[PDB]
Amino acid sequence: PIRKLAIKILVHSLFNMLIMCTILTNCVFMTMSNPPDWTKNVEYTFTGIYTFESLIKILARGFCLEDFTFLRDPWNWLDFTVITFAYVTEFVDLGNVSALRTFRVLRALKTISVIPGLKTIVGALIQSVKKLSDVMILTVFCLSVFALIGLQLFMGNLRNKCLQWPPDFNWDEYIEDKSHFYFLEGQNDALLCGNSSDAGQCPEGYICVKAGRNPNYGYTSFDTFSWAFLSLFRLMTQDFWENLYQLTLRAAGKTYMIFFVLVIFLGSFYLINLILAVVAMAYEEQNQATLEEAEQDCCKPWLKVKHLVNLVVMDPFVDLAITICIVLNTLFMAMEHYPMTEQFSSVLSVGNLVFTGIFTAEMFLKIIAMDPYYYFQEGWNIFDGFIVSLSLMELGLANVEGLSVLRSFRLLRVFKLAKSWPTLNMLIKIIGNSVGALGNLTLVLAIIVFIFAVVGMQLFGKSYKECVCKISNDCELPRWHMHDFFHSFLIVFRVLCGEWIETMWDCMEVAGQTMCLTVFMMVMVIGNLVVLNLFLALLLSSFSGKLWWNLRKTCYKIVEHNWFETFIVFMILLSSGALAFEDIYIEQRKTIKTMLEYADKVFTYIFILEMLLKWVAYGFQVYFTNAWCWLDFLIVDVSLVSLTANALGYSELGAIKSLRTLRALRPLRALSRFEGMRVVVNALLGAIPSIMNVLLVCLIFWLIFSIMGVNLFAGKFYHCINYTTGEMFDVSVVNNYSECKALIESNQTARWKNVKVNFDNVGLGYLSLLQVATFKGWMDIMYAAVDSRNVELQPKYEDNLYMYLYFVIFIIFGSFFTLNLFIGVIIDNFNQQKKKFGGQDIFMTEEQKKYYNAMKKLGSKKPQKPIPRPANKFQGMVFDFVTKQVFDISIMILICLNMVTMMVETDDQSQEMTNILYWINLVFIVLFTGECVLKLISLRYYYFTIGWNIFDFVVVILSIVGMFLAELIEKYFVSPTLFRVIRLARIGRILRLIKGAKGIRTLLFALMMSLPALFNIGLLLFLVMFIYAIFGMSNFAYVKREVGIDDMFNFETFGNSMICLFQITTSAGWDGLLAPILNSGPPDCDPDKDHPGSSVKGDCGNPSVGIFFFVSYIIISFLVVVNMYIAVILENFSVATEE
Amino acid sequence: CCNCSSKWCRDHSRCC
């Protein structure tokens, strides 16, 4: 007995199973928001089982006054914590309030302790955070240096409001009304304005004054370094950043985009490269060390009737006749749409019985001659019989409502193509790998998302309902809240999709800033780390005549010359730069307009005359085999046709007026002229067959979700609105289309309106799923799906609530696994394209490698003993003390004291605070001048051998200029906007802290190694931005000022068009620019707006050329930016390899 | 209600 007796129980797997299902039983009970009265005795059972499980474990280890037992394992501390908490609420009088019911989720962390294999994975993710320690010092350094730049430039600028000067307590009392400001179309956020020109204007009778709260809830500002640190972390995660972009340029001016282009490039690009490169480097040596470690007359006539069956489908193409009946069955289901008439639905409904009949007969005729139950042995035939069963269950009832989603479950036979099509099989192997060999890692991701959803629903769930009126319009819950488990799963799933900022404003407004900052930042640090490891583990396991000939030489010497190539490239850049001047204003100028019209002939007659020189110097055989001469041949033909129609007499026609829009192709002549653009194009077009075989899978795989979307939706996004206000009628007022047509005939203001990106077609379904896959536009589509009630009925709020699980499943499968198969094919083609060349480092040219192979030699070496001295004087004993580490470390500490005294600046601080901060910034300037002028006395001869002393001298001078010329600013010709900029020179002192940090310098050097290859790709992306800015400026300058197009950010001029194409290149808010362009006719737009003084009439858009504009720019910029990530992250593998 | 043309009246009202 004794120890022997109470020990056996501990070892059996039967004892580890009832605890493992007790936790899973209780994890279901954490889901319930209000616990009922009857569940309380079940909560006592769970406390009894966990006591008994720790009773067998105290009685197994050591007895008779022998210390403890399991007081060494970190997981029995969690068991001791959860027992001592579960009884402390049963100690007569202990609590009452009990705000920490959120310690009841600690027993949901006991799943790690009891499920076999989850201690290894959680212990392998903490080990990988230890590798990230040196990146996270550089990220917090760069988000501080960039947060001090915006805190000097944009100080409260976000509090400019546009106040009216009184039409019919002076100052404080008048500027604090919130009705004296100007609100644009009910935005509840008080338009921003600037006194600067190229800033936002105010309408007539208003002026801009800094007085008010701040945007969004008070949470968006650059006044109090903590708030500037929040908004540059929001620019680093690119999370709705394009509202922060457009707020700031409206009140600072449109020339401060240079801050935003630099901070998206240094912060959102480089830091996301360096984080994802060091995680993938850490995981690469984890599975390497693991692999290395592992290295270290019944029967008679039954058979008579069978033989016949067997002697079939083993040689003719009757197993190939099924795969043509599947790809026909997919296409009949793809033709369903709304609204379709009868005699077309009759083809759809007779046709579905035909394929179902020959898929039920084909598996009946397969289980005759293949010996069941050795039929349920292959797996595909199990999969075949499962689809046939639910197809007859769907036909057998036809009463499911709304459970007819199963008529989309016959779309799942398309995966039978993965036997022959070998890229669809790679898609199934990745999805099956998450459930299989990486199954315990996606189980940890299941638990952490579950725990984060239970925690925030216990902390914040009661505060949302008791504080509704702060964050909502009619004192009810918002679309996104945490009052139950399902909505608090959807917030936690959102954060993992990149949208963590908008929900955090509504938490901080309702539960305080400290408790919502700690929770939501932990969700997006831990949760984005686990998704990133599950992404890489799926990736690295899956691909684990006397005069006639004598004129030929003369033309050849011309085209081969060095003064002729430099002439044409000069003529190419001016022909393309002349395209930038064709604004709305070009009719009003009347002097640059006629210069454009003479230049449109001179440019054309040069590129004709140089073309005929290329015919004579080459011949037709040499010229028509160069593909770059084919590109220059087609551009002349567009120029020849519109010239010879403007000379024959065909001035205006539907084609000839539309060929003039094809002058935006004229910048494509620059591709064959530069070696930077030519190398990158040759490396993208070389990978183009690999992309097409993946894009074929992605179009087949998103076809299944899109035919599923037409079945759920397609007719159910129609609604009536009061169009004098634009708000959706109630279900009590308008129930359906019949009630609304009753209003319109009664002369009300109603419109049966659709959503214009919807699921009526398969083709419009592809456009709906691309707003959902990118996370731009997906709020509007999901609010319509969840309200979708039925065809011809008014939508009701969240009636079809569980249709979020459609969008969750598409983001898991058609965005997380679709992107996982795409990245794995480009990287696999990158290693073969780098191998076929011999070979090395594509996207660099031949000159650009020799600048690279010597810069590599420079950054990995160091000199020895530069130390002459000041020889023998009083200066020598000065040189003894100043060279010491005591003088070295005391300057670094005193720069850290300078970094803290810049963080204490605040908008609207006191005058006595400004003086103290001036006299301390005086005595730092005299100290750092005295530190560098002392180097000149006691190190006379050089001082300028190494770079950090050259850097130290210039930073001192610009600080003095910011002090010395500032006294001339109060004496002479003044501009405060130049005072904000020259004062930014003392942030250069902060950069001297990098001098000692070795390991950040390794990150910064392999950063600077990729600047040659990233320059070549950034020119091919500036050329595509420039071409798409000329298409959009000519097409979209007159489009109505709806959602994303306003008086400030539009396609009117070339400056306006380039700040909109830079925005779409991150993909930010491309749904908002597309929305006014999908307007075609009235009631929406007006085809006769007559905006003087131009011949052009109308403010409508073209939906056909706008979908081709935005969708094609999203795809081209996706391929060229994902080569930027590959070119940089592979440089980070090249310096860790040689070290 | 409020104007459904703002991103906030979307997310935080029922009228839209």
């Binding site: 009661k462 505060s463 949302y464 309902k465 008791e466 504080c467 509704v468 009126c469 702060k470 004192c475 309702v510 | -």
Partner: protein, 122 residues
């Protein structure tokens, strides 16, 4: 947050002749706007008896000066600090009964209700 939490003693036992503070705090998440905040204090002899309002907050304290109660009753709270307590000076045996506090703090949706059973000891 289905209802807004009002903290009172369910039973308050006070000696005849002493002063009885009837404590009554609430937590409502919105700030107390004196131009909209509402407080009513009533008395009823029994759970199924008539309620007599004796003090109200509407812009300011209104003491109804009920004849049987007297002028003894006083406000003893601070609405901005979420305290709506009252004081009954020199308590008499007839003061025994039920005292109800009803609280509205717009735009908070839920109305609060505290109920105190005051018992007068010898």
């Amino acid at each position: 947050g289905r209802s807004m939490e009002v903290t009172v003693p369910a039973t308050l036992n006070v000696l005849n002749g002493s002063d009885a503070r009837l404590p009554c705090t609430f937590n409502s998440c919105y700030t107390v706007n004196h131009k909209q905040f509402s407080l009513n204090w009533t008395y009823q002899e029994c759970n199924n008896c008539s309620e007599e309002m004796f003090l109200q907050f509407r812009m300011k304290i209104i003491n109804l000066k009920l004849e049987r109660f007297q002028d003894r009753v006083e406000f003893s709270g601070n609405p901005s600090k979420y305290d709506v307590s009252v004081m009954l000076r020199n308590v008499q045996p007839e003061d025994e009964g039920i005292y109800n506090c009803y609280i509205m703090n717009p735009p908070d949706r839920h109305r609060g209700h505290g109920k105190i059973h005051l018992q007068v000891l010898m």
